[PDB]
Amino acid sequence: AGILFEDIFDVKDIDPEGKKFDRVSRLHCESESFKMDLILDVNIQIYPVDLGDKFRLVIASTLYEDGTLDDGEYNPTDDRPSRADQFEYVMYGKVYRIEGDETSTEAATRLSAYVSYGGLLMRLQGDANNLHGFEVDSRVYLLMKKLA
Amino acid sequence: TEFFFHTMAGREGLVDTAVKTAETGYMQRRLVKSLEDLCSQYDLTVRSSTGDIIQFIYGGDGLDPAAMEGKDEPLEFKRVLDNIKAVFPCPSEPALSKNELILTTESIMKKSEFLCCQDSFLQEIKKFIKGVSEKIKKTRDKYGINDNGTTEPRVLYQLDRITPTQVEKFLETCRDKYMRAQMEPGSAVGALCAQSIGE
Amino acid sequence: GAAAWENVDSTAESCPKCEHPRAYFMQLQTRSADEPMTTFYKCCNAQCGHRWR
Amino acid sequence: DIVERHLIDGDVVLFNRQPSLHKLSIMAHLARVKPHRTFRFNECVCTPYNADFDGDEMNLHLPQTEEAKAEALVLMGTKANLVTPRNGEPLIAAIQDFLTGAYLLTLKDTFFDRAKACQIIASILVGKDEKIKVRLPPPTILKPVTLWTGKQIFSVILRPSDDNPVRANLRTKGKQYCGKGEDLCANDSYVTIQNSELMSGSMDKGTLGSGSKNNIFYILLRDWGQNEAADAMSRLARLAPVYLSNRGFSIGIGDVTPGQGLLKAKYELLNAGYKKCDEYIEALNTGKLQQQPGCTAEETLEALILKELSVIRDHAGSACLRELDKSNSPLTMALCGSKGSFINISQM
Amino acid sequence: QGRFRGNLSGKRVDFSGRTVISPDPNLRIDEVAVPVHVAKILTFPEKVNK
Amino acid sequence: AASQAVEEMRSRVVLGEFGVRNVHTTDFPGNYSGYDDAWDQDRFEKNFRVDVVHMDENSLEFDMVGIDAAIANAFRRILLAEVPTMAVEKVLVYNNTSIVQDEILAHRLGLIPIHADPRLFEYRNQGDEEGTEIDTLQFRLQVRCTRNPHAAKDSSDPNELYVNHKVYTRHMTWIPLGNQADLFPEGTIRPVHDDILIAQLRPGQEIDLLMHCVKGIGKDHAKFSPVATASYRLLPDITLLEPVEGEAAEELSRCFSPGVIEVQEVQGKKVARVANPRLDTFSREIFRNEKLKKVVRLARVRDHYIFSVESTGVLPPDVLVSEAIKVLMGKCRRFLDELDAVQ
Amino acid sequence: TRRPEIGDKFSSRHGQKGVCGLIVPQEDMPFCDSGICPDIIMNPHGFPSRMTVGKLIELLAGKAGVLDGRFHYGTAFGGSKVKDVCEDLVRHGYNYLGKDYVTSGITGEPLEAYIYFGPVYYQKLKHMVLDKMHARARGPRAVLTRQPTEGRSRDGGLRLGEMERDCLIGYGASMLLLERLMISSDAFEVDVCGQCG
Amino acid sequence: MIIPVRCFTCGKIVGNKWEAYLGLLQAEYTEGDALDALGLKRYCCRRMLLAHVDLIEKLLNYAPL
Amino acid sequence: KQAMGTIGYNQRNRIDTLMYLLAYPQKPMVKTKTIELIEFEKLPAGQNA
Amino acid sequence: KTALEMVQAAGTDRHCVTFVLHEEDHTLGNSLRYMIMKNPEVEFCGYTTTHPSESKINLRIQTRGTLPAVEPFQRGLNELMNVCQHVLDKFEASIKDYKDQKA
Ligand SMILES: [Mg+2]
Ligand SMILES: [Zn+2]
Ligand SMILES: [Zn+2]
Ligand SMILES: [Zn+2]
């Protein structure tokens, strides 16, 4: 399995700075298992969300569960059993920044991963143990599925 | 009344520009007629038409103002370092510590091609290398990164990641840019200065 | 005096240099060749002393 | 033998404007013959010539010597004079209808399907770009709907083909940058490009215009030569108009009309300013007025009245900017810096 | 209009034209469009070689 | 939900207060996961239909359901420019003493439509200004204005003082060439409107000219355009999110077109409902009322295009649409033949 | 008899002088629901820098007038207000702000933003490209100084003034300057005696 | 000078509806109702007919004749 | 001051060194009272498009 | 001489083909683009105009696998011809029944 990260998050705010964009919103989410905060740009026109929504999010290296990392080109017309069949909102991006936390002057253990899904910003911040496998200039798949 | 005042302001601006155009045209004519004799020779000394030297070196250093990337500075070391790290990311090479970075910088700078370079640019390169090494040291002290390369979280090595290949690429790029940004002999520096002052 | 110097409208704005609230703006329209107008903003709230166009 | 041949394609030709301020007012270009009767060139070079296409006449000279032709093509080449010798700032860059087009293209709201994205990409595949691969980038969103964002389409301009060695990298701030986001601004005004791919931020005059340093075209010129920068500028000039025409950008009387809250705020500010000015007049005429240092009492009153009027002006402008909604053409052109500013909007 | 300023420093030449400009974004930055009528007038001397 | 939003994006075009959304055609394979938008001739022939709602002389209006925006725009542009007709091209003048300029007179004569059937003629080859019987027509115009021998003493109006002072297009006399008189019956080759005012004359002035007309397409010049206004619009479909009654129903009826929203008294109270969304022009006046913004949803059907074609009178508009489709088929066949010749 | 082409200068009764950049066919012009295609398409970017709201007001008044068959007045410090023309527009079934739903003629798809249509009184200026187009061969020269004449009606050539010489000096093109100012302008071969000079 | 035959924007035949329009001016019809009765739905033909000035007779008054 | 349009009712018999005339001049739809005062609508110098 | 083919480079690769079409405009270009876009074996389809002065267009086709990108061209042409024939027949039948029911 190429699952680099997987966690269930709950939304705490939809637009802290106002309705800037009509189609994209800046959701802030907190995890229950760990203290992993997520600031993610999402498309509400095609995938509507609410304030009290809770969703499972998985960041994977590849879209195929069998472990085949052959992602030279993606053909949407091809039909084959993939991980996206088990989720509802799949994005494709690249981890373009890994930044350490500057709030803690000493004994800091928190990092943050900045990923640009075609311009849509995603900051995943939390303990460095959960961010294992994240490297710069690495293209990944985000899979979000709303829960009951 | 407001329309009349706005028309007054517009006519004032128009006559101001009309006088400014003529005044600057005359000033530019005088400046170019006075400065058209200077030229950059091959011995890096700006001399007049009669052979008298105006400057032993243009601008004190000898860099092309048209090829000035920074604010009156030849290169922006931060942007060049970021570009070198982005264009040539080496995933099969480990990161460098402060001591290793200083050692490889001192070993590369002492080569033959860096001898002909100016001393001020080498001092600036050394200062930037010392600064980035201090930053890496502070990061590794904050996050407890060990220089041996056996730390369990490898993502910690992605905060300030530097490899000797990127160091060599950055140094070679800086040297090439500093060599190509120098004043080319034969350029009419006086006319360029007159125009860049008159415009 | 700083109180007498701050005889200007600019208060609690955002500058592209240090985004401090207190500022000092000046607008110039005395050029017909430049179709747009001309701005001069200064921001010395934290003793920065910026002066740009 | 000597043959006085007609002006054909490929001949180096000098092009100049009569009022010359700097050396960039005259440049040697390559002549291409057209059936029309006017001198046509890329608008990105309008800034050196300081032209505005309002009936200005320009001169066109043809050298009669191979040495002169070669010296004109080399020294006065357009690709070799992309920056002025005054301060090194690039003058040949994006201009109006190119800054606004690229800004609207790189907006976060942009989401294009396969057909529209392919059309916008192919809109530049003319000339020397007819012998390169398209390199259609992978889509961002694919499970609900396969949509290509405008930022990827803009980055295609930087790296059209696979064999293109251009790797553009830039990290700078925009005009509407807050100052605290540090690539997480709510307005998305932090430009970050890695490997010729627009990761964040929106294009504007601060990044595509001819204002100062940190221009993406300037970075391309300083990193990968003149030819790559020229090709990128040509692709931008061929892409931005097509998308701007296919999307639509218009200004109407409804884009400059004031709102009810704006009118109320303006009325309150005018009343307050008039009351304060009357108080100052009464204080100076009848009684003693606090005289500002370095000036007389009359100049003090003049400065106070100017300050009150400027307060009214700036507060009305802030109220109008706050009450205006997005997708407003004047506000959009003011944000990207293509033409106008907030002061002109507040005045109009 | 003297000899130095009107006939030595700046003088009129042939093989040149003057025309109004118009925008055309479909051309490169180093390229300029020339009308057919002016192109037939401004000639270039090419030497016959192999 | 998400499926409803996807269907609204792929089937409807929503018009907002500040801008229009979902304007791009996206029903293509690979863009949608739960939809197989691959090309299918059977489904296209099943869903497509044409319904004419109004057809009179020089005017046609018909709705096409199932066609796309690309083919619709192609048909519109072919009708506007790529439909060949007959128009005046050459003007031979013999002693024009009129005040109107000769070039202006020729330009006005060129804009006059001809009722000749363009399918019965051919394109004139390069050159050949003399013209042949197949690919040209001749119209003689000879008007000599003179004073009226019998008129009142004052005769302030020019109609009584002079005769033939206004050279209408009815004075044009068609001159048959070769065997065109036998092929074309008398009265077929004539000006369309027969009342177009070409110029105005005075006694002493004379207008003598011959007009040579050849076949040509509207792309070369606008005088060959057979259609005056040939356009298409998306069919509006106004929907009500919540039932609106009371005086708000009258407000809805007054904000939109008078013929789309109708008020009815089902239980003694006035309630508004969509009667005929075709008559609506989408003036977007409902956005002015603050309360009535969130109660309606203006939209356009993506796969339903109402074509309105008003011609100049050269030929009926149905034959114009048929000839446009035939020209498109001919272009496709020419390209297929070229491709086959290449391979 | 001259037809507008590329290079003809046009005005719009508001100081917005312009030159015809491209002549697109009718099918390439966008169309509204009624089928009207515009004759002139002007750049909106000229509005913010110049603040020509009077042009928008004139356009709205002209649209209202051609809709209701009236002649609105643009009298200074008065005239028809915006509310009256807005009511006239809303009465005839058109938008109260001039912006109308317009479909792109090229792609056949509707535009995301409404287009501001309306009748504007454009006036053509005497500045024509045909009269201003000039090209100079070798041609004649002046008797006093063997250089091309000045004016276009006199078959004159262009003048490389002092500023052009300054630019050529700044570029450093010595051979180009020599060819322009010596070879192609007033080249001659004289005979000088090496004894007396 | 004279009423053009074709409209500038659309191209509808309008030269034949000029004198009749003048008749509607000789009658009690106003401008708007006359332009409506002539069959001009779009405002382009309305502008073409309304904003047109009849200068042909003013020139014929100076004609040689 | 440089606008093109009709000069007067005797522009045909007038013979000047340079004259510019418009084919189909049209009076403006938005006319000022000064236009009616100077009778410019009788001699327009532009077209409504 | 109307439609001419061009390979992507000197290697003569059939995956990326460019068809230069003469005496055409946006009409047929957009029609063929829409008709060949629905082909599942086409990765990239795009038409453009070189210059408004000259009457020519350039279409570019890039397939998924090893298709010569010439067969999808003929497929799209035949599909467009069939669509035109079908719409012509439907319009003729509609006009005929309208004339029948009107009288
Ligand atoms: Mg100008
Ligand atoms: Zn600040
Ligand atoms: Zn001697
Ligand atoms: Zn019309």
Side-chain angles (χ1 to χ4, degrees), chain F residues 19-315:
Chain F
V20 195
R21 305 182 305 270
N22 301 331
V23 302
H24 306 285
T25 301
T26 60
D27 49 2
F28 297 104
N31 295 336
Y32 295 80
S33 60
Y35 298 91
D36 189 7
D37 300 330
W39 175 251
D40 189 9
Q41 184 68 20
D42 302 330
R43 180 175 62 256
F44 174 79
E45 295 179 0
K46 174 182 177 59
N47 296 337
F48 184 79
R49 58 182 178 90
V50 176
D51 298 326
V52 179
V53 299
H54 181 60
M55 179 171 178
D56 47 319
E57 51 276 355
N58 307 337
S59 181
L60 183 60
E61 189 179 1
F62 58 95
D63 317 333
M64 301 170 59
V65 180
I67 206 63
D68 201 70
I71 305 181
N73 184 26
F75 285 159
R76 179 189 61 89
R77 297 168 69 97
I78 297 291
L79 279 169
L80 287 179
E82 298 291 338
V83 174
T85 43
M86 303 297 297
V88 181
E89 278 206 357
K90 291 300 179 180
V91 176
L92 284 67
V93 169
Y94 309 93
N95 186 23
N96 187 22
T97 299
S98 180
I99 300 302
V100 185
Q101 298 79 6
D102 300 330
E103 304 83 12
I104 303 300
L105 184 60
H107 176 268
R108 291 182 56 85
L109 292 172
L111 297 183
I112 299 180
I114 304 301
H115 198 270
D117 198 327
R119 286 85 57 83
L120 300 181
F121 303 100
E122 299 179 0
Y123 297 90
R124 174 180 289 186
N125 301 331
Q126 186 63 245
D128 301 0
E129 291 76 12
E130 64 281 352
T132 61
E133 180 268 349
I134 293 90
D135 53 357
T136 189
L137 292 177
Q138 292 184 354
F139 292 89
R140 199 73 169 93
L141 177 61
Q142 180 180 0
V143 177
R144 172 59 178 270
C145 182
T146 179
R147 301 179 181 271
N148 187 20
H150 297 68
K153 303 301 179 301
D154 45 357
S155 299
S156 181
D157 56 329
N159 302 116
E160 189 176 11
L161 255 183
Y162 326 110
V163 62
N164 295 17
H165 59 286
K166 295 181 179 300
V167 182
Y168 295 94
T169 182
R170 54 181 175 90
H171 299 70
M172 297 169 53
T173 60
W174 169 63
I175 301 300
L177 299 87
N179 301 120
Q180 290 177 352
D182 300 331
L183 179 61
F184 299 91
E186 184 69 22
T188 300
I189 309 300
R190 72 178 188 272
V192 177
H193 293 260
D194 202 67
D195 298 324
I196 300 179
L197 176 59
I198 306 177
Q200 195 179 359
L201 285 185
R202 281 295 178 265
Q205 303 178 0
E206 196 275 341
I207 295 184
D208 193 9
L209 53 89
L210 184 59
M211 289 171 291
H212 294 68
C213 316
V214 302
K215 191 176 183 180
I217 60 180
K219 182 179 180 180
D220 191 10
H221 196 274
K223 66 185 178 182
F224 299 102
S225 62
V227 290
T229 51
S231 60
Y232 66 96
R233 71 173 187 269
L234 284 75
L235 188 147
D237 47 325
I238 293 89
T239 174
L240 300 180
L241 300 181
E242 60 99 16
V244 182
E245 58 279 352
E247 52 86 18
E250 295 289 340
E251 289 184 352
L252 280 177
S253 181
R254 288 186 293 264
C255 288
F256 291 90
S257 180
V260 51
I261 303 299
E262 61 176 1
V263 289
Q264 59 180 2
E265 294 77 9
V266 286
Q267 305 296 335
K269 53 181 177 59
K270 301 181 300 300
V271 53
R273 63 175 301 271
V274 280
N276 184 22
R278 177 190 305 269
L279 300 180
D280 190 9
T281 60
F282 273 178
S283 55
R284 302 185 307 274
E285 303 298 330
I286 199 53
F287 299 149
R288 301 181 63 179
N289 188 278
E290 179 68 24
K291 192 264 180 180
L292 268 57
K293 284 185 301 180
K294 301 180 180 60
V295 307
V296 299
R297 201 279 305 272
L298 293 80
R300 287 291 188 94
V301 185
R302 172 168 286 100
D303 53 354
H304 195 161
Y305 301 92
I306 303 179
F307 279 75
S308 300
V309 175
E310 303 177 0
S311 179
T312 59
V314 182
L315 61 153

Side-chain angles (χ1 to χ4, degrees), chain A residues 20-24 26 41 43 84 87-92 94 96-97 116-119 121 137 139, chain D residues 108-109 111 138-145 149 151 171 183-187 194-195 197 199-200 326:
Chain A
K20 294 297 182 179
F21 300 96
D22 288 321
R23 300 181 178 92
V24 190
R26 185 71 61 88
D41 286 317
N43 195 331
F87 292 82
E88 300 181 358
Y89 190 65
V90 177
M91 312 179 66
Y92 182 66
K94 183 181 61 179
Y96 76 97
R97 187 177 180 89
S116 177
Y117 300 86
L121 301 176
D137 204 337
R139 300 179 179 272
Chain D
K108 200 174 300 180
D109 293 323
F111 291 98
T140 299
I141 310 177
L142 49 88
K143 180 59 185 297
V145 282
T149 175
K151 298 191 181 60
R171 185 177 183 89
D183 205 7
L184 291 184
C185 178
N187 304 330
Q194 297 183 358
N195 298 331
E197 297 181 0
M199 294 286 95
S200 180
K326 55 185 174 301

